[PDB]
Amino acid sequence: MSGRPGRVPLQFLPNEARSLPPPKLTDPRLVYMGFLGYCSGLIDNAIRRRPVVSAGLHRQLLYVTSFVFFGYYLLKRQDYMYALRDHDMFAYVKSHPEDFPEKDKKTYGEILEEFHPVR
């Protein structure tokens, strides 16, 4: 991570993160973060003792848009870190066969797992 080769510091979504499928606008994680924008909208009028459901909708609309915007790139970075974590992981096992052997998976007919009577 903080030391992987070919990394540009302070660089957000890089030139290969775009190879992954983008999160959909109907992403359940994304809309929930939009719901946090909706929640952060209504509470604002509570401190300022304003109608919590029918006050200035410009604040509420701007509260939701900001959350849904910054979330989308975070949700893009979300998968890219996991994809990068998954990518290098599979290269290591391929490059180090001796640390990850394949046991000859044998059926339960041969397995001597003992029986515990409960009574």
Partner 1 sequence: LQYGPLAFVLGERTTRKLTETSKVITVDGNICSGKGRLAREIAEKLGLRHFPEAGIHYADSTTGDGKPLDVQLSGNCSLEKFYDDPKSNDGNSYRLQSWLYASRLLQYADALEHLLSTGQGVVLERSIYSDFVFLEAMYRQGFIRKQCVEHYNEVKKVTACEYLPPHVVVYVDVPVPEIQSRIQKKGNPHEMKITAAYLQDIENAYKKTFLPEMSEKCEVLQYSAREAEDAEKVVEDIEYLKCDKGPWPDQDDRTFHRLRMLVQNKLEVLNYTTIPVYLPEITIGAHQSDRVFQKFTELPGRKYSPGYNEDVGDKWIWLK
Partner 2 sequence: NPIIYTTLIMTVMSGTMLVMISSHWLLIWIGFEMNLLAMIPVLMKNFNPRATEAATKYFLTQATASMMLMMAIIINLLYSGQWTITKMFNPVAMTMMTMALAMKLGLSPFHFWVPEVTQGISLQAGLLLLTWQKLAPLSVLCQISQSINPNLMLTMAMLSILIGGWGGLNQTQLRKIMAYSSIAHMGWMTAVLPYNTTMTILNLLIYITMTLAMFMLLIHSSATTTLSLSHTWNKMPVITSLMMVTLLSMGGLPPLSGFMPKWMIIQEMTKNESIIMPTLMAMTALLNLYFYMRLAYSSSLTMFPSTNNMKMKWQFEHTKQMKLLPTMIVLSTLVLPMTPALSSLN
Partner 3 sequence: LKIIIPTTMLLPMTWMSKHNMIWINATVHSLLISLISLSLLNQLGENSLNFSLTFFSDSLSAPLLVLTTWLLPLMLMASQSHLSKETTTRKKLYITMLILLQLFLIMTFTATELILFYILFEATLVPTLIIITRWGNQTERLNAGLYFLFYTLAGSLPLLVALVYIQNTTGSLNFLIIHYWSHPLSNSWSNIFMWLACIMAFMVKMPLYGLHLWLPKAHVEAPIAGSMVLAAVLLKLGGYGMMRITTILNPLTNYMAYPFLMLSMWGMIMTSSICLRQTDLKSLIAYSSVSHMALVIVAIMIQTPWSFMGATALMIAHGLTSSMLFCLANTNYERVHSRTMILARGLQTLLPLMATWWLMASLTNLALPPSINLIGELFIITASFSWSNITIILMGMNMMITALYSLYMLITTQRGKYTHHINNIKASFTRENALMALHILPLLLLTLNPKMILGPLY
Ligand X SMILES: CCCCCCCCCCCCCCCCCC(=O)OC[C@H](COP(=O)([O-])OCC(O)COP(=O)([O-])OC[C@@H](COC(=O)CCCCCCCCCCCCCCCCC)OC(=O)CCCCCCCCCCCCCCCCC)OC(=O)CCCCCCCCCCCCCCCCC
Ligand Y SMILES: CCCCCCCCCCCCCCCCCC(=O)OC[C@H](COP(=O)(O)OCCN)OC(=O)CCCCCCCCCCCCCCCCC
Q: Which residues bind ligand PC1 (CB under 6 A)?
A: 1-2, 7, 9-12
DSSP 12-48: -S-TTGGGSPPPPTT-HHHHHHHHHHHHHHHHHHHHT
Binding to ligand X in span 55-84, by CB under 6 A: 59, 62-63, 66-67, 69-71, 74
Query: By the criterion CB under 6 A, which residues form the site for ligand Y?
Result: 39, 52
- Nearest alpha carbon to residue 63 among 41, 35, 44: 41
> With respect to ligand PC1, which residue has the nearer C-beta, 70 or 92?
70
Residue placing its CB nearer to partner 3 in the complex, 104 or 114: 114
Taking the C-alpha atoms of residue 40 and residue 43, their distance in angstroms, rounded to an integer, is 5
List contacts with partner 3 (CB under 8 A). 53, 113-114, 116, 118-119
